[PDB]
Amino acid sequence: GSSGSSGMAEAAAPWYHGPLSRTDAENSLLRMPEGTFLVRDSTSSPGDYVLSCSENGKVTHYKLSAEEGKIRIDTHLFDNLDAAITFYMEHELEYSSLKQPLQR
Known part of the structure; x- marks a missing residue:
């Protein structure tokens, strides 16, 4: 068909970058x-993830x-990754709140 793979791609979230290094x-x-x-x-633990942020x-x-198929970050527990991202849009993380996904 077309270029074709632009359909979809495949719908990992706009903020997800896979096995990216620090x-x-x-x-x-x-x-x-x-x-x-x-x-x-996660660069230390297969099956964990890492949130990276531009701050201060x-x-x-x-x-x-x-954790039992749910997401633990600092002390907080969320059902999934998008719920953890949404929590740090409504609230500050450490120096600011989340504002936009990194482009790809």
């Missing part, structure tokens, strides 16, 4: 304004650990 997350978010965020596979003139990283 250095690449940091070189993207240091170039973006504050409150730009992404989620990636730097880049930050927070673990989204798997």
